[PDB]
């Protein structure tokens, strides 16, 4: 109720150039180069007009997208307000390309047989099964990679919140994919943060953030009556921060994929790494940190930039999820997607 130091609040408690813009320009005449010398239901419709009025009186912190998928894989309800959804595009092919590359002999019939099983339990129809929650993917490579009670905590959540068959079938697919040089990446790109699902029966319409900040979404205590909104990499240890030594500065986010070329059963691990050095410098640090370059066989560690978070203090030791999994939550993420640069 008013301050002592007034100038700081008129700006805080709250243009004239555009007003001055139309003033010289638009107020301007026939010149330039001038000639010489119904109780509440009813009340409820016009104030929606009023909002349509206002939204049409004016006019970026994000881009938003919606898609329709099945609940076979994925599943929005099990998941919550802040979650990683990964797209898993073009699974219609067996695929044919697995036959290409996969230097002989790898038995390229493995994928076609491995995948069909998935298909039998959980055709083409009109709702494709896209959208595997990123949290869900960590579960797939979880036993093989990273550790225990952490990777495992996440996986229990996926089978519990989505069948152990599908988990096992999908795990057989991940094994078969990492086997034949068709990787889990070059599949499963990032989709968003899961704003609101709107499911029916076996169907789901998932809205999720293409990019922009998470916390500013449906918001509320949760979006609707949910836990709330946040961006948390699923792995407490299945996400990592390689700022072993660091300053106070904006920190970039990358999605790192690593592989064992059959060095140790061809495992594949995805980590949401956080560092404060540019993509340009990330390759060297990654090389020092990861040593799947133990094949002899060759390649590995493709990486992409998720976005750039300029806020550094929200990673929380929060066990609760879904079934509780500890998840690191990073506040302030701004999404600048970037492209795959692993080679």
């Amino acid at each position: 109720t008013k301050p002592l130091p007034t100038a700081p609040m008129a700006w805080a408690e709250s243009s004239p150039r555009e007003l001055a813009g139309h003033a010289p320009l638009r107020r301007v005449l026939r010149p330039p180069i001038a000639r010489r010398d119904t109780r509440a239901t009813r009340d409820d419709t016009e104030q929606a007009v009023d909002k349509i009025l206002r939204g049409a009186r004016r006019a970026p912190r994000y881009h938003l997208t919606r898609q329709v998928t099945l609940t076979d894989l994925c599943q929005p309800n099990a998941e919550r307000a802040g979650a990683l959804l990964l797209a898993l595009r073009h699974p219609t092919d067996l695929p044919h390309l697995a036959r290409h590359r996969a230097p002989p002999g790898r038995q390229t019939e493995r994928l076609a047989e491995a995948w069909g099983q998935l298909l039998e339990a959980s055709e083409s129809g009109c709702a494709r099964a896209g959208l595997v929650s990123f949290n869900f993917l960590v579960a797939a490579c979880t036993a093989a990679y990273d550790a225990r009670d952490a990777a495992e905590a996440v996986r229990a959540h996926i089978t519990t919140n989505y069948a152990g068959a599908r988990l096992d079938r999908f795990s057989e697919c991940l094994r078969a994919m990492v086997h034949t040089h068709v990787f889990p990446h070059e599949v499963m790109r990032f989709f968003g943060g899961l704003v609101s699902w709107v499911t029916q029966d076996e169907l789901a319409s998932v809205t999720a953030v293409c990019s922009g900040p998470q916390e500013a979404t449906h918001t509320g205590h949760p979006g609707r009556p949910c836990s709330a909104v946040t961006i948390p990499a699923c792995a407490f240890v299945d996400l990592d921060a390689e700022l072993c030594l660091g300053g106070p500065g904006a920190a970039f986010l990358y999605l790192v994929f690593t592989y064992r070329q059959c060095r140790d059963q061809e495992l594949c691990c995805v980590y949401v790494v956080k560092s404060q050095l540019p993509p340009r410098g990330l390759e060297a640090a990654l090389e020092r940190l990861f040593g799947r370059l133990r094949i002899t066989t060759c390649t590995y560690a493709a990486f992409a930039e998720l976005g750039v978070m300029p806020d550094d203090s929200p990673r929380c030791l929060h066990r609760t999820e879904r079934v509780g999994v500890p998840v690191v939550i990073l506040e302030g993420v701004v999404w600048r997607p970037g492209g795959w640069r692993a080679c």
Binding site: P213, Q214, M309
Partner: peptide
């Protein structure tokens, strides 16, 4: 004198005095 500054952030607005 005071001279507020302002700028967009990662989930805020953030006036600095």
């Amino acid at each position: 004198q005071l001279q507020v500054a302002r700028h967009e952030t990662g989930g805020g607005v953030n006036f600095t005095l």
